[PDB]
């Protein structure tokens, strides 16, 4: 009356990931800042949801100082951020 039962089992695997898409940071011309500004200006207040959101996301000093009167200075912003405004607007213009 005696038994012997050894059992050892140890597993791991999790290498499924894919997300790293970088911004272009492309040279945005001054004419493109003005055009972009006008194209966002013709978009109504609830379309401005993403617009202001990515400006507060990049620029934290505006977020804390003025959550009310948020000066989105297109001509003096990041060309990466201006590409995010570019991505949004052209997706919201060019249907299909």
């Amino acid at each position: 009356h005696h038994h012997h039962h050894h059992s050892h089992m140890g597993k791991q695997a999790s290498a499924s990931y894919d997300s790293e898409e970088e911004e272009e940071g492309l040279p945005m011309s001054y004419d493109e800042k003005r055009q972009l500004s006008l194209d966002i200006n013709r978009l109504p207040g609830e379309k401005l949801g993403r617009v202001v959101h990515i400006i507060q996301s990049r620029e934290p000093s505006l977020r804390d100082s003025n959550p009310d009167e948020i000066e989105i200075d297109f001509e003096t912003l990041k060309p990466t951020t201006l590409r995010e405004l570019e991505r949004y607007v052209k997706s919201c213009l060019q249907k299909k």
């Binding site: 800042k33 500004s37 966002i40 401005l48 000066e71 989105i72």
Partner: protein, 39 residues
Amino acid sequence: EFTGSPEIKLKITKTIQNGRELFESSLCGDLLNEVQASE
């Protein structure tokens, strides 16, 4: 003299208006000239 500033910027004013509260784009609209001739 003027010393007027252009600046390509839209001041998004977080306002509450209508049945649906919306915030709208504006700018720093002070120091009006509004036509001249006697100058």
